[PDB]
């Protein structure tokens, strides 16, 4: 007679934590912001079009110089574009055609991919030979690879479909820590600006916050009513937004342990595929399943803009580090940039 | 100031090389058919050729039969990738319920694949595999299909269904019943964008790959005719 009583413990604790976070829930956010001047009408136009891919584009990533962006498609190619001049620099082939993620190193020296092959392939761009090949092949997951992000030129954190996120070491080639605790598949993760802790959404309507130093889970946020597709931190590192498949976006807080705002509308009935904040954090950009991506207001929860243009489903949405431009890849092999 | 022109020329040359390579491998990407192969389990998919990718070629046509036997059993996420695939091969094991009622699970999985939002345009090849084992499943009488299906007792063999020379009328009846269950699911929902191609696997593989090639050709022809607003 352990399981039977074990559930109660959780239940008891659940109610206690529920109480704590709802007790400190005095005001909302809207109220505390009703006073602010709304951003008003915002108009965007596609400045550049990147027609180089063959199959659907499923993930992209901006570089730290806000000039070079890498893109990954299901045709087996990993193209490194150029925002300012629309010139491909490296169209490197890939072994596994079903790539589901890509990343760009903060120093601009490495890129990484990964998909159904269960392997996080890391590529080196500073080869003395010139031609770029794969340097290290990380293989320690059982489920598919969904999102990978570099911390530095030495260690990379990867999400997986086996409910376990892991921190890798490129020099050795083995997992340093293992962030077990999720129940469903893990879709996306984002790193905080200080690179000390990170959040990771999954397919159980939960966005667990981890600590890379201790290798354990610190805060677990529930609120969505369906599996979570994409997440991203607020520029200050004290908040992050989560876009799930229930056609709702929610901003959470790491010091209140409770959701602050719900970005839900009646007309939208399709789930969110990608989400990313702006430079100042005033504009929240989300990518929807209805062929277009909207631009929500992070404090007024009103559609301040809609960015159409894409024919098929959008899959990735990146904002430059300096906030000058926004890129939107979709399932039509196109990469529109917006200003 | 000549630095700007020479770096621009170098970048244009690199872009031209990238375009040439992209055209060269797009010329071959369009000619190779992709084929997702998934099943309930213990179906005997190793006889197709006799860590999961494999390829074959028939009639100067390339194929990529992508096995997924390494992932988990939660298919609602990684199956969205296989929406540009030409034909989702769905092999079923109708005689693997001895160790569960796998037939109902296969039917539900087929219904979920058929009615998915992103799999609307993907046709499905159906393989009623382990067909020879159906005969012993009814003579022994340990487990009856009619026990797990109440419409089997009131079922009659189709008039246009050709009996296989040397098959007990009851096996043919059971196999055509199962075919029709899958085909009811297939036609109940919208089917203007994709079609189902039921088949019965035999003991040799020289005809199975020919069947797959013929069905893929039919799918391509129907897509081309639909593009021209014919059907």
């Amino acid at each position: 007679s352990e399981l039977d009583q074990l559930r109660q413990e959780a239940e008891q604790l659940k109610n206690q934590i529920r109480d704590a976070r709802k007790a400190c829930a005095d005001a909302t956010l809207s109220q505390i912001t009703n006073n602010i001047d709304p951003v008003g009408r915002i108009q965007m136009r596609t400045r550049r079009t990147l027609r180089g891919h063959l199959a659907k584009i499923y993930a992209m990533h901006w570089g730290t110089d806000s000039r070079l962006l890498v893109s990954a498609s299901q045709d087996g190619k990993l193209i490194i574009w150029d925002s300012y001049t629309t010139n491909k620099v490296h169209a490197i082939p890939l072994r596994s055609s079903w790539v589901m993620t890509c990343a760009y190193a903060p120093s601009g020296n490495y890129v990484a991919c990964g998909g159904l092959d269960n392997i996080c392939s890391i590529y080196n761009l500073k080869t003395r030979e010139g031609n770029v090949r794969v340097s290290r092949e990380l293989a320690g997951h059982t489920g598919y690879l969904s999102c990978c992000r570099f911390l530095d030129d030495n260690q990379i954190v990867t999400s997986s479909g086996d409910t376990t996120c892991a921190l890798w070491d490129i020099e050795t080639g083995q997992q340093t820590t293992t962030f077990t605790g999720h129940t469903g598949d893990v879709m996306s993760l984002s790193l905080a600006p200080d690179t000390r802790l990170f959040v990771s959404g999954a397919c159980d309507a939960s966005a667990k916050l981890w600590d890379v130093r201790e290798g354990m889970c610190r805060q677990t946020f529930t609120g969505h009513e369906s599996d979570i597709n994409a997440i991203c931190f607020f520029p200050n590192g004290n908040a992050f937004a989560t876009g799930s498949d229930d056609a709702t976006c929610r901003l959470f807080d790491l010091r209140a342990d409770q959701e602050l705002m719900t970005y839900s509308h009646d007309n939208i009935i399709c789930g969110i595929t990608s989400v990313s904040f702006s430079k100042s954090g005033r504009l929240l950009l989300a990518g929807y399943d209805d062929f277009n991506c909207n631009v929500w207001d992070a404090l007024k929860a009103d559609r301040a803009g809609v960015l159409a243009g894409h024919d098929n489903r959008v899959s990735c949405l990146g904002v430059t580090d300096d906030g000058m431009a926004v890129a939107t890849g979709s399932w039509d092999s196109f990469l529109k940039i917006w200003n | 100031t000549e630095d700007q022109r020479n770096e621009e020329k170098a970048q244009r040359e690199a872009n031209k090389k990238i375009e040439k390579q992209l055209q060269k491998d797009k010329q071959v990407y369009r000619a190779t058919h992709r084929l997702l192969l998934l099943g309930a389990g213990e179906s005997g998919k190793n006889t197709i050729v006799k860590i999961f990718e494999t390829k074959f070629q028939v009639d100067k046509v390339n194929f990529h039969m992508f096995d997924v036997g390494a992932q988990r059993d939660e298919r609602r996420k990684w199956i969205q990738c296989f929406n540009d695939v030409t034909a989702i091969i769905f092999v079923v094991a109708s005689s693997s319920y001895n160790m569960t009622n796998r037939l109902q699970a296969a039917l539900k999985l087929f219904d979920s694949i058929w009615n998915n939002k992103w799999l609307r345009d993907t046709s499905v090849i159906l393989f009623l595999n382990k067909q020879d084992l159906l005969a012993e499943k009814v003579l022994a009488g340990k487990s009856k299909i009619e026990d797990y299906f109440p419409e089997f007792a009131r079922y009659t063999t189709p008039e246009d269904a050709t009996p296989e020379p040397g098959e007990d009328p009851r096996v043919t009846r059971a196999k055509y019943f199962i075919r029709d269950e899958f085909l009811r699911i297939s036609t109940a929902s919208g089917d203007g964008r994709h079609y189902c191609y039921p088949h019965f696997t035999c003991a040799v593989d020289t005809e199975n790959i020919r069947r797959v090639f013929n069905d893929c050709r039919d799918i391509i022809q129907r897509m081309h005719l639909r593009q021209y607003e014919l059907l």
Epitope: T163, T183, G184, C203, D204, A205, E225, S226, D227, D245, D246, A247, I269, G271 | D73, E74, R75, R76, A105, K108, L109, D111, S112, I113, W114, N115, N116, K117, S189
Partner: nanobody, 128 residues
């Protein structure tokens, strides 16, 4: 926080009638297709019945077709499965399951091992 509770069940004389009530709280009950999945002791999970968003499309497994009925009440956020004429080989634990995608006609919840949106269940036995 999704939470599916399965009240009812217990010990029943073979041939009796039990009404299983599934309590849901945490999502819009009217937007999801809800199913009933059972697991007999000795083998894996198997789908029993289902119901559409409004309750029009209703299906059953052939082994329990006609004997069992399913009904949903959207205004109370509850799922009802009423048992009739139980049989000895109906001894199993019944999980109330929901689908992961709202406003969709296809979904993949039969998964046995680890499916989040499924309750603890209620294990039922027939009398001897």
């Amino acid at each position: 926080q999704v939470q599916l509770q399965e009240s009812g069940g217990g010990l029943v004389q073979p041939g009796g009638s039990l009404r299983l009530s599934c309590a849901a709280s945490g999502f819009t009950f009217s937007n999801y297709k809800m199913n009933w999945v059972r697991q007999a002791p000795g083998k894996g999970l198997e789908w029993v019945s289902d119901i559409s968003q409004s309750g029009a499309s209703i299906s059953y497994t052939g082994s329990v077709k006609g004997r069992f009925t399913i009904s949903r009440d959207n205004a109370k956020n509850t799922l009802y499965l009423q048992m009739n004429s139980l049989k000895p080989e109906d001894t199993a634990v019944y999980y109330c399951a929901r689908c992961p995608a709202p406003f969709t006609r296809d979904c993949f919840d039969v998964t046995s091992t680890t499916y989040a949106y499924r309750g603890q269940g209620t294990q039922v036995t027939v009398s001897s």
